[PDB]
Amino acid sequence: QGSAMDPPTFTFNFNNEPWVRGRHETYLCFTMEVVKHHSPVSWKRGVFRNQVDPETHCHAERCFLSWFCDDILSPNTNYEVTWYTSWSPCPECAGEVAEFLARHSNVNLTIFTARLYYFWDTDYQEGLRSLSQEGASVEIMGYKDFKYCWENFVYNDDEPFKPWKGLKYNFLFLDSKLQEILE
């Protein structure tokens, strides 16, 4: 589960301009409601933070899966889990994930992402492709969701969310490209 992020670390890593430059980390946020015989018994949620440069799988998406398996995934359960990530995933992790999913119906996942990482690369595209196609919701994190993250996952000091400019357009464009990839 880790720690929440100070406001700087958040607004910086969650800034949604498609070509932002200097974001050497994927910040992965999540809410998860555990659900045993249909009654949600508990809710746990958190923030994993690591690098995005390809050295194998010390990728945020994997440190997630390792933790999920160590301290959770009980035998007979159903999980509800969703992700607020700063960068979309690499394609290799998009693999290990989509796979773990096809291999566990008792996990339902949905992905909200500030940015599409390398959205123009046939290979990254095909990753997103197999996540959508294999039972995961995948969409571009917009206003609703940003505010959501400002309150939940950040040491905000009970202060209010202040949007950055273009956030509305930045969203609009990323979603155009995304519905494009999947079309």
- Min separation Cβ 13 and Zn ion, Å: 16
Q: Which residues are annotated as a binding site?
A: 59, 90, 93
- Min separation Cβ 64 and Zn ion, Å: 11
Q: Identify the CA nearest to 128 among candidates 89, 82, 80.
A: 89
Buried b (16+ CB within 10 A) or exposed e, 38-68: eeeeeeeebbbbbebeeeeeebbbbbbbeeb
- Residue 126 bears catalytic tag: no
Please identify, using beta-carbon distances, which residue of 59 and 115 lies nearer to Zn ion: 59
Pairwise CA distance, residues 172 & 33, whole Å = 30
Q: Say which of 17, 61, 134, 151 is annotated catalytic.
A: 61
Please identify, using beta-carbon distances, which residue of 90 and 136 lies nearer to Zn ion: 90
Please identify, using beta-carbon distances, which residue of 46 and 95 lies nearer to Zn ion: 95
Beta strands in the chain (DSSP E): 25-36, 39-51, 78-87, 107-115, 136-140
- Min separation Cβ 59 and Zn ion, Å: 3
Helices (H), 44-89: 60-71
Q: Which residues are annotated as a binding site for Zn(2+)?
A: 59, 90, 93
- 174 within 8 A of 115, measured Cβ to Cβ: yes
Query: Cα–Cα distances in Å, from 10 out to 7, 36, 47, 147, 164?
Result: 5, 33, 11, 11, 12
Pairwise CA distance, residues 31 & 84, whole Å = 9
- Min separation Cβ 62 and Zn ion, Å: 7
Please identify, using beta-carbon distances, which residue of 23 and 147 lies nearer to Zn ion: 23
List interacting residues with Zn ion (CB under 5 A).
Answer: 59, 90, 93
User: Could you list the active site residues?
Assistant: 61
